[PDB]
Symmetry: C3
Subunit: 349 residues, 3 copies
């Protein structure tokens, strides 16, 4: 029906128990040619309950980890030592491929919800995880080696090695904790658009060294019920837009023939907004959303309504008069009606 829309039911449950869930969005190009440009990227949700640990693993892929809800303790293990980070809501960090990490929800009441955005390069489109832990679904990758190699390696009898590393200890890879460069925040900077209806924060690869490497931008969209993000488009960034809280009425325009792709988004729903496609966004409730833009370097946002950054207002009358049915002045007058910019009252009068 709409190829740019990924309902929260298009997520595959990789793992689940009473402690938390790991879910994996289908390939962007599983169902359509129109997203060949995204085939290298995958999205994952990690919901975990209080006082949980995600057992040590490494990914074959680079991860952009982004805390939507709650607080987390991330530990990266390198051959040398280990780095520990408290991530609060809105914090993001890049976990290099090959780095072994584990994740803790310390809060005694607050759930944890984390968005992983995997950049694949080994096998494009596919994310493999390597867990050290023998569990029910899967054993330790150490167990894959022969009796000889393991014994020679650790200078130990296989019986010691098996009873100490390789036997199945835990049921799952999310377990209960005993009954008891750096990260950066989306909203660490001042919002690039901010009036009485909405804020939009944005970190660009131009401004953050972790993102320059990935050629990604992140933005945090906040709006009030009834507010409208007026028609605009990005020059370069293809933005994967994730409904975090609230419901959003989205209208997307594209193309042969002129097509309109509208949808109402609930918590967990994703729409892909290609570069140069005009888009508008009404808040059905107070909502915040999180955007991940690829091909982000040099991105520029052109508006088609409101006072500020309205490209149509920069078209001279002599040209307007020819382009449009209205006279040059008739057009210029209609564009001056709307006083606010970016975010406006989207309520029927």
């Amino acid at each position: 029906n709409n190829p740019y829309l990924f309902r929260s039911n298009k997520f595959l449950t990789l793992f689940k128990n009473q402690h938390g869930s790991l879910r994996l969005l289908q390939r962007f190009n599983e169902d359509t040619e129109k997203l060949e440009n995204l085939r290298d990227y995958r999205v994952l949700e990690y919901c975990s309950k209080p006082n949980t640990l995600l057992l040590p693993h490494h990914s074959d892929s680079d991860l952009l980890v982004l805390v939507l809800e709650g607080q987390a303790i991330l530990v990266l293990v390198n051959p040398d030592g280990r780095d520990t980070y408290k991530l609060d809501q809105g914090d993001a960090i890049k976990i290099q491929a090959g780095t072994p990490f584990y994740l803790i929800n310390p809060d005694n009441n607050q759930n944890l919800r984390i968005l992983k955005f995997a950049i694949t390069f080994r096998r494009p489109g596919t994310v493999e995880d390597f867990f050290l832990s023998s569990t029910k679904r899967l054993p330790s990758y150490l167990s894959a080696f022969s009796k000889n190699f393991l014994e020679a390696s650790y200078d130990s009898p296989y019986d010691e090695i098996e009873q100490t590393l390789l036997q199945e200890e835990q049921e799952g890879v999310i377990v209960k904790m005993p009954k008891d460069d750096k990260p950066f925040n989306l909203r660490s900077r001042d919002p690039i658009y901010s009036n009485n209806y909405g804020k939009l924060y944005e970190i660009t690869p131009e401004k953050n060294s972790q993102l320059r490497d990935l050629d990604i931008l992140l933005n945090c969209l906040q709006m009030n019920e009834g507010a409208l993000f007026v028609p605009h488009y990005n020059s370069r960034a293809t933005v994967i837009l994730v409904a975090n809280e609230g419901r959003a009425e989205v209208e997307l325009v594209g193309l042969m023939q002129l097509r309109r792709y509208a949808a109402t988004l609930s918590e967990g729903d994703i729409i892909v907004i290609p570069s140069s496609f005009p888009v508008a966004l009404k808040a059905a409730s107070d909502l915040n959303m999180v955007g991940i833009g690829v091909n982000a370097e040099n991105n520029e946002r052109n508006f088609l309504a409101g006072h500020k950054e309205n490209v149509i207002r920069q078209i001279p009358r002599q040209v307007s008069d020819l382009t449009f049915p209205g006279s040059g002045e008739e057009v210029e007058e209609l564009l001056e009606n709307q006083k606010e910019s970016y975010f406006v009252d989207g309520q029927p009068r």
Copy 2:
């Protein structure tokens, strides 16, 4: 039959009326595996008559715009203001994806002929254009939005909005202008890299021009006299899309399992693709000028197999020549010394 040849009839007419035409060359990889390296690029012709306007639109693709014939006024609109450029014949400029522009042929007699070279990145191989204009073939992309959103957006009744923006005024996206009235750069802005009595070749490399560095492209303007021959050579890295602009060219291309020769006579509007490392030679049937667009251009080097200057065979020592070739070392060295001129030579039969 010849997969590197794109006749002028391989262009699809996107739009046409009595004011001008916009045409679009088929994908380079539509008909052969042999051009996978070009699948991200598309070529377009814009021929427009005097005192015409191309209505405001933006592309999803980066455009390299290049004026073959005439003069034009290009206006790039940004959210901040707008930039205006006079393009004369041989002028080129990069139009960023997402930039809304319009194009005017002001000359009261001279036609306008422009080459668009689209670098695609959103949907590889595909160029979409977004026109603000309600026309016969297509309505404004603004019209696509709901009655609610449009009204809320412009703070106006839909009646006003439809009559002012969305109603069809113009018949086409090329319209006649009313009666009673970084920066661009020229191919020939530098000195030609090869220049004798038979031919000139101008060349801008990404090494020398910041707009091209980004695209990893080179442009060259080839001029030759009837009967002149561009002697056998090849590029190391650059795969050149070669556009017959004026005159007719006898072209011999050598390639590969099996050894093949891909020859053809080229007319105004014809294109041949000359892969990297493929030996190529080119005789002028008439006085011709051509335009070259080379991809993978960074660090390109041109090796010749004939003439005095830059003839790689002349750099092979006699001891090795004698083994490589049937002739004695000296017999070879003597034969390569015969041809006195370089690059461009007399191509006339004796």
Copy 3:
């Protein structure tokens, strides 16, 4: 069965005579989707006997040339002049695409064995060579041009041109004779104990490699030695058995699979990024590694004292991850004293 394994018989013999052979490994992705990441690269052997010449040609591809055995005289022809290089065993150089070169084995007794690693960009996965020489298998690419163009070009009669350039002189492309290169072992080895050395040039350290985003390593091990379980973060390494025989255990993936194999002279195993790998020397062996996606690569070990990531996991977390008590784990990882290379002899 094992898609990462390329036996020496999987090389296609492009040309052969009593003077030498040119052989070309099948596409990495011919038979499996699991190596999409390598589809731009091709491997070749050039084995030539003493006092031989490889006739002047240019490639459509960038070549990383690497001398496994013997010594060679490489001549690169540019439009201006020519550069001549003596390569000794272990020497490597990048021959840019389009550069015409020829190759000589001057030694009166030693064979020449060269590993060519082609980086393809024109037609991805395909290497074309363009020989100036008329031979039995193929004529000079000059012969392709018309009588007119050739005559006009060299300002000479076709008779002279044909008898001097275009006629078949030689039987084959290997005939009997009448910036700078760098050695794998030019630096100090990054790992060195009583069982093994590993040399490694990274793109970080060598500007010829920075361009190609490649690392090279020279692995030397003593019979019975074991390269303990490790993985690279980013580099996918094409591993070439040069001398000796190696037991290789490679672990990967929906299902957990082990890809073991015994490798002989000429055999290649591809070791993906993030796949744990271990390697026992059945005999004294040396191998050559070509790692792609090499920029910023990091090697994490799962056994031995130094650079063992499992040792950096704290007890409190270990206790949960593994069946053993925190200290049971900590103690077991302390048993093995040496690092990287260990005694692989069974108790």
